[PDB]
């Protein structure tokens, strides 16, 4: 991006595609770092009852 319109137009044409819509270089669209803290889910078998291993 950050390309003068004319270069973009030349780009889009020479390529035959609207390459601007889907640029390869990433700009402020990528997930920000330090995404929020994760509280992951505990799966089955964590029941404190009727959880006999012999049955699983």
């Amino acid at each position: 991006a950050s390309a003068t319109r004319v270069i973009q137009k030349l780009r889009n044409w020479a390529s035959g595609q609207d390459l601007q819509a889907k640029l390869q270089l990433r700009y402020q669209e990528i997930a920000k770092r330090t995404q929020p803290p994760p509280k992951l889910p505990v799966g089955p078998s964590h029941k404190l009852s009727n959880n006999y291993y012999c049955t699983r």
Binding site: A3, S15, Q24, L25, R33, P38, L40
Partner: protein, 178 residues
């Protein structure tokens, strides 16, 4: 569900118009010119390369990088020589021998990670109960001599002290996940 690639559904019988279009394709290299347009197009796109020393390719917290041994905030090295980091190392890299320190505490007399043997799996990071051995962020530790790559407890503890601030931040970010 299948899909035919390169299967001509039917025999389009040549029509002069069709023939001309084709003959022009062979005679005036029309498709070849199409290919040149694509490369000219990128010539105008911004290059994706990074100044390597000045800018660095992004690595998130789980990057394994270079081994380090951490210490408790008080200053007591975390490792208590349970030696299962040695047990689960796939490459036989970590060698640990221990004896009860004078304090009476359990500690490792010798902890040697052979980095040339290590394949940076990150299981040691996984296995440690006190999480004393961690995969530190640094990946730039290329060395002139083979011996430098072999690491004893003092290099790893020193590596741990140097990168402790970032190691602590990285473990802080990823521990909920683990």
């Amino acid at each position: 569900t299948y899909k035919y690639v390169n299967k001509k559904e039917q025999e389009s019988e040549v029509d002069m118009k069709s023939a001309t279009d084709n003959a022009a394709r062979i005679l005036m290299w029309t498709e070849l010119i199409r290919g040149l347009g694509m490369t000219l197009s990128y010539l105008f796109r911004e290059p994706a390369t990074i100044n390597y020393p000045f800018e660095k390719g992004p690595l998130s917290p789980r990057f394994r990088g270079e081994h380090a041994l951490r210490r408790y905030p008080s200053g007591e090295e975390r490792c208590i020589a349970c030696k299962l980091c040695e047990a689960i190392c796939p490459a036989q890299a970590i060698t640990i021998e221990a004896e009860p320190r004078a304090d009476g505490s359990r500690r490792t007399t010798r902890y040697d990670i052979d980095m040339t043997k290590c394949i940076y799996c990150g299981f040691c990071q996984e296995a440690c109960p006190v999480d004393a051995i961690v995969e530190g962020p640094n990946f730039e530790f290329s060395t002139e001599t083979h011996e430098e790559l072999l690491y004893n407890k003092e290099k790893l503890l020193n590596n741990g002290d140097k990168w402790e601030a970032e190691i602590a931040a990285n473990i802080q970010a990823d521990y909920l996940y683990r």
